[model samples]
Target chain A: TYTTRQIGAKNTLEYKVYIEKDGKPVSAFHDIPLYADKENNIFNMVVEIPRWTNAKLEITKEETLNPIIQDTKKGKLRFVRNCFPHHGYIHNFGAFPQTWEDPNVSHPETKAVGDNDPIDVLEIGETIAYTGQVKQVKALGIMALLDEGETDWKVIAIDINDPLAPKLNDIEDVEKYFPGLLRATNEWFRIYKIPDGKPENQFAFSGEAKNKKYALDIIKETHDSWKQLIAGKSSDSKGIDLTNVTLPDTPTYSKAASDAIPPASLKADAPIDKSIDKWFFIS
Target chain B: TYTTRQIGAKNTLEYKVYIEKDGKPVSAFHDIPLYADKENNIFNMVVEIPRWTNAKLEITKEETLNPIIQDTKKGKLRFVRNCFPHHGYIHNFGAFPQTWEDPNGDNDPIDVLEIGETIAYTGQVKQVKALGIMALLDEGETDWKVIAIDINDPLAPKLNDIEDVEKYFPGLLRATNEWFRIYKIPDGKPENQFAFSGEAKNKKYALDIIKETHDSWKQLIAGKSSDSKGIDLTNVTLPDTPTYSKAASDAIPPASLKADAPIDKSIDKWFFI
Candidate 1:
């Protein structure tokens, strides 16, 4: 259960900001008793641009009477990779970055072409996620990607709170939000030489709380107190340590999910394996 | 969800033995697997039969066996200090032999001057046990009394109220004092040795000794032993009997649970354990 005790630890509702397409990153995370507050729209996010650089600018609400990460005027496209369409860039596509210069945490999984940062998030989202033009952030599908060579563990998410996005409450709803996006992600990752199952290549999702409720808890907690989880911080309040975290249970098997997975022949330059193990074919 | 996995582990059902009234012993213990198999009524037993005690005789079935712990044909009474007028023992009878001579495995808790060993129970009741003449001996004769029952099952009976018993459920034993179960010894009784009328001890939760003793006992008997974590009642269907615990919470959206955050993770989704 996500308790008030885990406000910052496992219930992170914070995100860094940046003008997509091109710009310097800014440190823009929130310290509050998140979601449920009418003000913030909580979602897990990461600055996937300029791969592996902690470009987030540390700017507090007091530091900026206004904080904006999406500016379309200068063309701040929530710059996402449209399934590796040649140049590997698109606006508001909810994607991972193409390069692997650093890991997701201080220590990364892929040292060769990796980022030292962890990709899993317990982000508590709110106000700073919007600016007049763009309103999209990645709502992680609660899974991580670990390519053997440039193995940066990048998890997948959705832009659930996109003003133009539809309401998502289940795996089916998530499928509806992107329509064939998971299959496309599978196809694209296959092109980069990553397989479809097992620890080295499959989506590493948080199994224990890997459900619709996991996402909902973040939205409900700070929906009312986005400011308290931060102000109330003390020696007692624990912060999340992404360096060492893992999913407890593996994705269970299901005949229904098999329908969503693309056939091995259809997955890109590389052929897909007939059996994807129990990697929960992302429907 | 007591799986067939643990039908055998550190949990075996054995019965202890003892005699009471005058010597001295407020607390006693035993460790074994017990109850219903043929001859012995095994409930991890013990025998604190005074300091001269060669103590609890290790009497097993089959040994040119009449299967008896003591004959007492010449009248040897292990007299006890009577705390109650009815059966000489009731409720929280805080009286012991005032010593801790040995440990069971590691660091034992019961004091000194206590029983160094335990006795065995063949329990040929009706003739040996006299009311008001003796206190209690862990509910059996032959000098063996059940001291510990490391239960890990789910469908075992729970005796809560002796007086208001008929209103209780099955799988419950509201009355069983100085009883016999394994070998019935011809025309022997299987009733409570002590009466359960209007006394406060009649209520299962009344006495300190009961609480102390019951605390060591779980809510059920293992139809099968369990995993290190617990039983997995995911596919279990309960019979019409009272269980020690509620059905595993997630088996079918437990009545007292909500499918929301902060739910108890330590649940057995099927059985009420």
Candidate 2:
């Protein structure tokens, strides 16, 4: 089990969530195991944003301990636009730990470079996961979003403990059981940024959702990229903090140094702006 | 009836509204009369952005014909934040024609908030009474917002002062103040600061501000003691003024409206910041 500490004022630009495991701080991006059950092909997902919320929260790649923080644009707190029928975010949004979509390497299928972050996961489970929650998930499919000229791959997955996990073994299973959901997911990514006065985002593979085996191949590829990042072999680590208390004998391991990194005292969550409840009815 | 001719494409950065009266062109700024009834203290308000809308529309000061157009920042059209509980804009927002809040005195035209129940359209001119004025220190400039009531509104006679506004329409003044404070938060701006600690000063105080702005406008049009701020003073009626140019004024309305760019239905999405 993991614990989280609030690192700054809630609802402000300074807010962040620092995570710890077994009472020792660790980099959520670097130290968390990529696969919870490697033989069964189940991966670890560090949930950063719960479903139905607008705040663009993510695990920081640059900050120490790789804490989760809200993203800002043009000096203002950035909120994802609700794509009409879909409000805020449709699924539990998070990122896979110990996985990097290497910016320098071009994907074979999308032909676009990485979005300079870890591989994103859209958890299609019934329960809404809280920020800093880690869950063992089974990969179902993947979609290629060519966002602002970068290949931001979105992986589809389900929590192993979820009710429908036994039934969903492949991407086609989701299409059969959850019909219209895959289509809505594709539509959400395509137009989520349009309300911010940006052009509609384009997709790769003609916007087709890839299958389970194909998703595992991409996950393995990103996991290898994370290996390069951790071993200091990648061409550019892109300023990601490599500090960790867990991984030993690796380039980034420093138990004493990682322990020295201070964490902010927890405080009550800052009041969220009530305006977030307002909805815009668009065609 | 004053008819509006589209100056450019709709929904795009270039879109504008050029107005005409009696088949002849008039500058929405310089030529439109300030006093719809000078005897009754009623002023002419040029509605720019209607209630329940987010686009920051205003009458252009620098452009020929002084057409009403949308404001943009960093090449993108700017939209006001919804500011919760109050969707879009709570009032028929506009500006008083023939009034200039000298930028040297600090900036822009005198803005008015018409608290009428009915939503007004863009370019619709209405006679309004000065109810109160709030001193807004916008970006360190002394930007003043005049709180007024539409003469046709049922509550117009009831609202005579800032106190009267509180009596007739409770919570409105507080809401208005709150709106101005947080509206720019979405644009990456901190909550706006106000003068008099965000109080809406009474009618007498507002009228003094109106007179001061009117005098400053008189100096602006007469080209005596003012800064032009690159504003095109071309007007057909104000030929006596040194800034008037009949040729430049004629060039604006004769121009035809371009095809409106299709508005994305997504533009109506209210973002919660």
Candidate 3:
């Protein structure tokens, strides 16, 4: 019903990422192709996310990679997240200084809201997001940055699609088709403060912690796999064989898995709670 | 839907003289309207023969005229052939000289053919029909002159519809509608020809006959019956006080007892011949 294209072998796998609102997945904003590669022993994929107001940050990430490979063997080809930490202040608040900080501190002539909140310590009222294409991964994960008063560090694997091997085969070509894909993905790390504590009531940092660890593991595995695939040290058994890959019949992701994976409550917990398990685990 | 009209009265009987063809009665080629007269005490009727055509003539004279009158509660009427003997040629045969020896013979010029046969006697075929309506009816009892004819005569009874009656009723309004209504009665003698031939086959003749008899009977039966309701006398009963008047209901001739009644084929002795 929707259009598709081949990026590598005629039967390469393809997929789309659908944005969501109120737990319902939205239709595709655009489509991208994932090509099969025999030399790298990887399925290269690329997607473009255009700049849009009211764009859904949450998405239902699906993979038609393996299935499409299987279908073409039988027959066919087809086609997130949060946090805060400082350098968090500069990383989160530095880009938009006019609104991010109290203007009165720098300009005494004007009567503006003074520095009532710490920029580096992202509060529950702060709006946080992640953006950009993840080059390589061996497991599922997401990338984010927490706004901390003293320190700000990048957080990878925060809300990742196919964390195991997130690196696309032809990153250059993907950048060509969707010029804004990487730029949009990079903007996800920027954090904004929601005034009046309205959204703070619904914010949570627990899942951010959990996703951070998951993302780290995925990134580690991806690096290891990339090494094996490149060094010619690994056998053809473990990683995907690009030459025989094909499109899949069922391309949609299982709704239960995706829903169950995201945190149910987003309320910020006590400062002592360092992991997302504090929110998901009952005990 | 062919049209029809009533032609006579219920109390007044009517008759027409016809020749026998194939041993059954067939209408003569002439306009005839005969009816009963209660005052005279005699069933009277008249037929207008064409004067020239050699038409076979047979009159089934009335026999039980009194009984018919009693049965009809009106009167009876019938053709009386025996009373009027057949004269040798009503019109002179040699009045005018022509190519043919008997060229002046008026009757000789006409020819009556069998059904679908040509009227070829004079060879003026286009003006004539292959077979005339006269060939369709059976012959009757009287020894009448036979003619050679190709087409059915204009006077033969043909069945028709109600609209015809409305169209022609104007000419016969003086005759009273009831006189016309009698001919419309399903089993009545005047209506018998339509019942036998059917409307589609005899349309024109049936309408004309109904109109003619209705006119004559209206005049003849005027005083004898009331005319309060638009000349309709169908509901009027015969007068209770009668003086054996010839023009009254008791005088018209009945059909069966006439001298010219057809020989009863049902009788064994009559069939033996």
Candidate 4:
């Protein structure tokens, strides 16, 4: 379990979510363990943005103790388009913590370099996830998004406690229980950025979701890549801050220093932009 | 008005639909005018395959008096995959006759997706209004698909442009794009790509494309474009355009036309992918 500290003004660039574990500040990116229960094939998912919302919230790589921040463009906060039939994101969008997609290495199958972010996950559970909420999830499948030439792989998972969890064991099961969902998910990712004057995103394997076994292989690979980044073996780490209160053996970890750190002054939750309610009917 | 004579065996590579005007043979590709009414912005659409069916039927440019035939690859008659939620085609899928998207262009007749409520018959000619156009980057070629509505369709009165389409029929445009994008994927082909991020250009743009392709067709028939190398320019009408001798045109068809062969049961098989 984790707690969230609302920092700065909402609907503004300063708005962010600083996470805490046991009342101590923890790096959402570096400190969170990748595996919640490895033997059971369960992983810890850091929810950055909840379902049915448009704000593009994400973990900041360059910030100390990487906290969840709302993404912006040209001094204005960015909100993803509400593609019709889907409110915003089709699932609870988040990422698997401590799983880095190294930019220097190109994926053998996708033939594209990484997006230099943690592996993104789509939690298809019942409840809407809160920002900075770390939940244990079971990986079901994965899809390779060839976004503007970079490989942004999306892992499809479900909350371990969700009612549908027991039935969905693989990508095909997703189709059986939730017919047309996989198709809708793929369509959502392809056109989400189109309304912002971006090209419709392409996909590898013709947008087919790989089975759970394949998704696990990618998760384990990315987990190892994160270990490399923590061990200072990455080619480019200039903008990334490795500060963490846990994992003292790592070079960037300092228990006393992290413990001495103070949280940002809390501000009132800013009003959400009314324009976020606008819908785009773009095909 | 026109009549279609089934020229070959159905469910086989030999299956084809030949068009005739006034009981006389006419080339579906070369003889049919591009515009049903140029001033009205209505174009002539040759429906090769109807909606809710999966058969790669197309006009054969290489054959004399081009007739609609089943497309084949690797000695097998090809069938497009039914991208789920869509039975086969979302709308009446066909092409504009006498409008050649030359090699310099997209290298085939400009394709059209007629958005009427009814499923048109194969080889049926209809006057359609161009509502929008989408640039499909199939493989690497720029195949432009025009979105049109049969002037006779009940929805035609309301749909004047691509925006009107969004206003009247929500989700159809996206569904059309999605159809083309994923239809080929089930056949082991990559998702069809698009230009302008897959947004449908307005009617004006679609008309401009139609005019450009019509001009290309004129050049091809007049022997001014080398892109007509394998294409048969044989026709019965169109003053100054190439035409075969009357006996030659008569010889193009067999003594009697055959009825459509039995459709393969396998063609009805749906692909869930």
Candidate 5:
């Protein structure tokens, strides 16, 4: 059974080990790789144990032992689990800021990896599914901000006056509770940028033309169902057309990998100390 | 011979008078109507003179003793000019707030008197002429108060790059000062609602057309002339061609009457108020 604890709390503990080669540190915190399953839970870590030639090592949880394995002709190696709290490993990685250092963190990077790599390690989270709802809330929030104390609030008020007002609340609740909200929002937001000539309607929520058609049908049906629900009907059997919806053809900034590391390779002159001088003076 | 005093130390002075009607006290004030001429010079009273009923009262300065006449049988009366510095007086019969009033000391009613009665009286100063330069100044002042500041004040910046900078200054002054400088400023200010418009070849000021071609011009021009002169050349020379200019056709409030009471006979209710 897996148990978790908070980092730095009495119930939680942490450890760090430095890997060295030839009495010099090659890299710190470089070998640890986090892994997640399809559900984005149970994040696991693995690291290549470091070893030295002609070293006999013993390993135990309490012996301060770096689990080193040696092969007679090869070398000796070390391995250990650096555990802390529930998100202790996350804290060790310096939380979200450090995670951001990894170029492959967001969806575009994952999509790139999906395109180039044979095996996709990026797990889609539950929050990704609810992103549409979160985006709706964000859009609504922007409208609210712009219209504060103006007449636009009256439009929202009118929407709230319907008997199916509570159903709209359910839409908001899905966005709040689901972890997939961010990804869903990103996907739906991308609809604004989809090319017009794509075979599938790019606005389809599922990123597939057929799925988007079905989703739009379901969305309409859901709205109609709420109307029936408010009118004392237990259910409404009418189904919406799943193929008629088309993706919108609005223009957007194209998704492209941004230049990394300031493109120093493109510089024509020798690097100068940026802190002391910036202008390039010609003799 | 008439003598003139600069009144250098005392351009204006005040006094009090006791007024009586039917041998009872009616009203009293510290100042009364003297008179003003084209030069804006005011003079002092020389004698107590009675108000006229049907006389052309010529205002002049001289000291004398005059009587207050009251003939109740014919409902005729006369008033004396007391030594009071006042704007003017309004005397009426039949009603308290009626427009008709008798200014001369003569007992003859103005309506009953035949044409060309030519009644005359004396006062302390000369009468300012109507439809003169001063009248125009007064009239222009009223309308100038109504123009949007951006159009009337030259220093104001334009709302957009294409806004007409010329619209911000007096048309005559713009022609003199900024017509050339406008080319230097890229994307010149566009002509807006307050901007003057005219035929491409005609090149006339817009406000002038609005004032002259339109009937509402009367109200817009009223009480706004500078120095009470007949509308100044700057104001009257506004290129006013009714055929080419598009202006509102509504009738203006009927010409104002020279009376003591507020005229209630305006064509529009708002104007009447």
Candidate 6:
């Protein structure tokens, strides 16, 4: 018996007013807000990856239509295309669900994974399912570092509005509660050179550090909120069309995959080297 | 001899190539043309500010330079710290002369100050020392807002056309071009009057109001365009520079307020906030 509840999710309140339209889905007031003041905008943070890097598929906000998928690499959604040059990996990087927000909206801060949006889950379970997953959040950390140019901060959780959703207590013991998540997230976060696109996020995986504990929190956060937004919210104003069986990364995201990182010993965390990023100097 | 060349200029031709190591003067393509697109990058919008909140000077395109100037307030540069919450103020934003455009080259996008750079002041200027400036940076401001203001400033320099910028304050430029000429204090008001009139207009309303009235225009233009909201000047402290202030809001719409918008100073009015 699935519960009819509003998951613990915090969406970007992009100042877009919501309303219904022509027997279709709900429409928005403006594609954007009307004012140009501080309260109406989001700090524009972008993570660059080329469409040639990884493939994309989104489950439309629509309940059952052709999923809206696209290759974000090289597109505006992507950040600097070259890898090691602009930044380096810190063994653990990029968080999901948790994001940085500005006035009107919020977006995923880390590059190399999750195309600046929220994560989606199709089938909730002990071994969760993440839809349109791109990169992984370290297994051991539910909270990790978020870097923006010369700034670095903690990318936090999304379910702050709700108290009981599966939350990450501390960075250390994430593995004890959420077994094999950081290591198991690979099920969906794995290389999405897509079933047909480019190797867009290819470099992210190679130079990345893996963590299962932190990764597990990504999917867990969705259970409380995913159903509310994915199943019905998009029909409001966010403009997603996931009506059909749904596609990965399409219009929105409908289908999801296991949050389990599948425990693999590909690459361990680097010995916290500070200069690795400097070594890739373009700075 | 004083350089007869335009001291403050603007440019925005964002599509180009990059490399590093030849620390000379920061050079660039063209005025970030008047539109916003996947092609025209925002890094081309910064000028430069040697000052930090409790800061210093920097100019790094790789993002590793001097630690990027952020207000910790609600401004543009820093994403979120703990300065101002309503809106902060910053001196540095946008990284030009050096950028993060690739599929091609490399650029860190942050670093120490101008130390990460060299020099190539083409007809530099002098000062009996220019000093003493003020403008209330919002109390709720922070570092992230600083970057945003500067990045949105349309006044740029010319690796190709160094003259006057139509968007921000008196202007911007430096090794890295991470600046917010208009986002900060008055670049000496009145003298640089709000060029918003019938016979003639300058470059004040384009910066002040847009950054003020249309403050949220940042996300408006970069994210969506469909709107029914009236684009009228609400509460702007109009200037009287270039000898024109009566033509306030009318100036923005006539400024090509809608051609591909970011396409040629069009979006500059929109993104000014």
> TM-score: which candidate is best?
4
Could you give candidate 6's per-residue lDDT for residues A1-283 as a string of tens digits? 1111111121111111111122121111111111112242111111111121221233223322211222243442221221211111111222232121111223253442223233321111111112222222222223222322211223322221122224533433333443443342332233222222343222223323334334453434432333444444432424433232122333443222111112212232123222211111111
10 residues in a row with least lDDT, candidate 2 chain B? B264-273
What are the per-residue Cα lDDT tens digits for candidate 1 across A1-283?
1101001111012232322112212122331111222344434343323211111222122322112222122432222221112112111222221111232223222223332222223211211222212323434443234455443332344455534234654445545544544454444343433222323243334211244444434333222232222334222223321110111121222223223322222111222122211111121
Which model scores highest in DockQ? 4
Candidate 5 local lDDT, B162-191, one digit each (tens): 123223222322221222223212223322
**Residue range A112-156, candidate 4, lDDT tens digits:** 888889999998765667888999999999999888788889999
Q: Could you tell me the TM-score of chain A in candidate 5?
A: 0.14
Pairwise DockQ winner, candidates 3 and 6 = 6
Q: What is the DockQ of candidate 5?
A: 0.00
Model 4 residue runs over 4 Å out of place are A264-268, B1-169, B172-273
- Residue B75 of model 2: what lDDT? 89
| Alpha-carbon lDDT, every model | 0.24, 0.79, 0.22, 0.81, 0.18, 0.23
In the range A41-136, model 2's lDDT, one tens digit per residue, is 999899988876788898988887788889998887777864434557878899999888889978878888998888999998766678888888
| DockQ of structure 1 | 0.00
Q: Output the better candidate (2/4) by DockQ.
A: 4
Task: List CA RMSD, all candidates.
Answer: 27.7, 20.8, 46.2, 19.5, 34.7, 24.9
> Which regions in candidate 6 have their CA more than 4 angstroms from the true location?
A1-79, A83-116, A120-138, A144-219, A233-237, A244-283, B1-273
lDDT of candidate 1 over B201-271, digit per residue (tens): 33223223322332322222232213212322121123332322223222221112222122121110111
- What digit string (tens of lDDT, one per residue) describes model 3 on residues B93-135? 1100000011111111122221111111111111111111111
Model 2 over residues B65-184: C-alpha lDDT tens digits? 788898887788876755433456767898888888887755567989987655677888888999999988866688889999889876677777789877766667787887788777
Looking at model 4 chain B, report the run of 10 residues with the lowest lDDT sum: B264-273
**lDDT tens string, model 5, A123-184?**
11111110001011100110111111111100010012222333433233323433343343
Question: Which 10-residue window in model 6 chain A sums to the lowest lDDT?
Answer: A1-10
